[PDB]
Symmetry: none
Subunit: 160 residues, 3 copies
Amino acid sequence: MHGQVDCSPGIWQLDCTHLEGKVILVAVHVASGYIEAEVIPAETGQETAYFLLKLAGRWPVKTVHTDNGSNFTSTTVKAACWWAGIKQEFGIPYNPQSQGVIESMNKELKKIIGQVRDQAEHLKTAVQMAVFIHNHKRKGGIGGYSAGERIVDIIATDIQ
Amino acid sequence: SPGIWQLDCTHLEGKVILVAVHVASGYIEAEVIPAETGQETAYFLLKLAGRWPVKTVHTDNGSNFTSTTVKAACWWAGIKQEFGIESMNKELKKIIGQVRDQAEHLKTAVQMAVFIHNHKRKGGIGGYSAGERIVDIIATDI
Amino acid sequence: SPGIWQLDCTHLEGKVILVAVHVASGYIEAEVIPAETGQETAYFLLKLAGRWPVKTVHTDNGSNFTSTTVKAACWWAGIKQEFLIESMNKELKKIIGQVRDQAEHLKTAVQMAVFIHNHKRKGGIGGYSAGERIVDIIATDIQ
């Protein structure tokens, strides 16, 4: 939720969850807890490559971890990663508590989407609503910092 | 590498068999599992880790292998998982059929077959059975 | 002798644990079985005899060790049946308590404890582990 204190700023995890028969691709900045998410037409490697190219043109993505789905091991993905300078790593690191960072995120996210699902006509709107909420949520974790503020801050310090 | 192993699942008689092979010696361990689930595999690989020095394990993207139960056991045991023996599933099924008639149940025949494959004299001279080979490679490593 | 083994059944949480100890090294193999019968002892024996060169197996007169199902298994496997493990059992149960909470079923708790005993380096001026000694002895015997 608020990130892992011993993680580097370049690590990201990526997974696909499912809601109402739809495909939701998620990406989490392990160190802050910040996430990006989106509904996709199909669970293809072509769809996973677009998303990763969007994510690299904005954040300094060094390494991404994913499971071994056909969509994640495809050559379009692989090629995409090579182009972007991303080091791919198959297998989402295990954690005895959360099972997986990007795993507890897909859960928190379906939790939120569940609370605000009334205030939306399309799942696409709600997905984006949940992410906004997750990202602007502050907590004692650090002087009232949110996930969205932690990453720009972590990436700023790095650049500086 | 002595710590490298390959795991895979095969089918026979409307059943499922979990097969583990030591790539350096060709040594095998196998067992007929009630279902191709990640929990039956985790238990299996856990038995195999407190026995042999398992560092790395290679498998396909099969559900039971990309399961979290298996992921958790590998983390607890200190095993690095890789994805990406096929002959080993072939010889094993060959020997299973040579001793299948000596048993009613497949679970028993499979173990008779692993015993056979691991102890069968090779080269026309002792000391070279898959089972003899693994014990040497590990000791020469320790 | 590197081919001698001691087998015995111990109980925990109303379940049956079938323990096997390589007398020379101290290395063990444990397993919770459905029932304390010959069919289960046999099956277990054939897996152990398939990975390690077993010759003799020391058990008591338990109804499961003296069954013909177990006898025909030894015959097949070329194992002599003779009618340390006792202590081993006590050792094994001690570790099982240390990691018991780390597992849902006693099953894997038993396997976790076997992993811990075999990989633990201790005894004899502290150097090797029961798991490295067994491979060293059998390989020394083959060489």
